[model samples]
Target: MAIIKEFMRFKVHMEGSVNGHEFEIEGEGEGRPYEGTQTAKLKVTKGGPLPFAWDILSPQFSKAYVKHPADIPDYLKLSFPEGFKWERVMNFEDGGVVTVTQDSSLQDGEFIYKVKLRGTNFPSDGPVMQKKTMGWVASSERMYPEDGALKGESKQRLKLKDGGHYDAEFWTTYKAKKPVQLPGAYNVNIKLDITSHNEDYTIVEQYERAEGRHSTGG
Candidate 1:
């Protein structure tokens, strides 16, 4: 967790006439109507520059929430179009990848992938989810594979607190795959990608993913 040296700011403006006030608005008069800067005290809303988000005041909200995580298919499903047979394995943290396959059956059908939860900090900034794939150890920022290495990314709309970042000791989930070694195939690595884009959603705090490969065991 890094310290947010600078605070995030958002500006909110309210526009409406006071219920019982005589508000008259005018602008650059060029024989046109409602096409200029409005001039009315009732229309000017302010009182911001608060502690961190110096541009927000009197926040308001609404909701139509329902159906918690348990029922939601853990994986983003879209990443696995065929909804193929996949397995979730391992719990990675610290940003370092480890060996997922060995020259043994116990290490069969195992792969590795990643997930991230980013907090926009200020509630005013709506959170959006996204991800991409890598082409067989080719890149990190979303790229792909042909032998089905279990599409990696599984993004979701994150929940935030009054002020939040990455996540509060939270983890993400990934489902990779495996296929026994053969004569010509490299069988040394597995890779794939999956992403998310939803208005409302939730995933468990825990995560996992695995793939198939024959590594030169260490």
Candidate 2:
């Protein structure tokens, strides 16, 4: 778990089969075709030169900095080493975000962001995440903070299973700390609720099945 959280400052290199599936499948059982290798970096810091304590900067400093454990929880199996970078498309206030980019080919204008739990060396047969798209539909936003940079929490409501389905409202909070990290320290919190609906259930189920098979065969 510590190793996984340590990835706060690591690069993600992904290479495997990829594909696209319509929300609705045709009579013919064909998912689609997709494959590729991509790389993204994950970084963390204190506000400035040397702000936070080494123990604080190190992995497992807190629950947020810890990785998801490997176990079957709520009828699902969690694969380790599953962290990734979270990239979003937004008008950057800082000069760093040169230009806002998107896949231009997709029907939707949403951007991809990486947010993984568990550690690296994820189970080969578990739920293999090819890509992670964040804050889509209509539009999404993100903010990058540095030393002494005055910033506040970004608010957004995520409708669970609200995709084409009309039902109840089961949403959660996305809380982040303010200009808390002082000089030479990089600190902030991006809190997301852990409640997901049908689609997430399928994802977890698929992961558990694949992992179970792999364990038995090995």
Candidate 3:
């Protein structure tokens, strides 16, 4: 038997077009332990027009939550060992963001896209001095205090001039840390905002978990 305290979980669905090129992006993730997936699709109209492109960036993708095994009672210890004593444990995979840029005046109207994934830490309101471990299994990637974080990236340059379309997908389990006391409910907010340059057009979507569960077994 195991006890799981979920802090925050959310999903995002985004679809739009830029200068005759169409694209769609969909994803979901958790903040408590920090893991998620994102999928993207793009349709490039060959010879449609010049100087048409778009870029998607996620600045808040590294935000995460923090917890300690020592604070949990023996009976409440879900997946740890008998002699597990550490300052803290961080639940994260590899997280990152993606960008797609196209320019006609550059080189035969080439479309360039890039994906950058990294592991990060963001201090929270929890413990003062606790040793931190970054994986559930010993074989998983480890991030020590001096190591700081890890990062990965991918890029591609293509020409979409004759009915050319592209589809791309990327996923990262990256997370950042914040401190919090358990045995109570907390608020986790997820907000999505979009802006249109043609005029003053904007779209905003928000998800709030006012009753998020956080427990330190007493």
* Model 3 clashing-pair count: 13
lDDT of every model, 2 decimals:
0.19, 0.19, 0.24
Candidate 2 matches the true fold with a TM-score of 0.16
Error of 1 at 140 (Å): 11
lDDT ranking from best candidate downward: 3, 2, 1
The residue-by-residue lDDT of candidate 1 on 100-177, one tens digit each, is 211101111121111111122223222211211111121111112334342333221212243432211212122323
Task: Give the clash count for each candidate.
Answer: 19, 17, 13
> For residues 69-156, could you state the per-residue lDDT of candidate 3 as single tens digits?
3432111122211111112122222221233221111112211122222222322321111112111110111122122222112121
lDDT of candidate model 3 versus the reference:
0.24
Give me the runs in candidate 2 sitting further than 4 Å from their true place.
Answer: 1-121, 124-184, 199-218
Best by TM-score: 3
Looking at candidate 3, the ten consecutive residues that score lowest on lDDT are 131-140
Residue 132 C-alpha lDDT in model 1: 15
lDDT of 2 at 93: 19
For residue 182, model 1's alpha carbon misses the true position, in angstroms, by: 18
Candidate 1: list runs displaced more than 4 Å.
Answer: 1-83, 89-143, 146-148, 154-157, 168-218
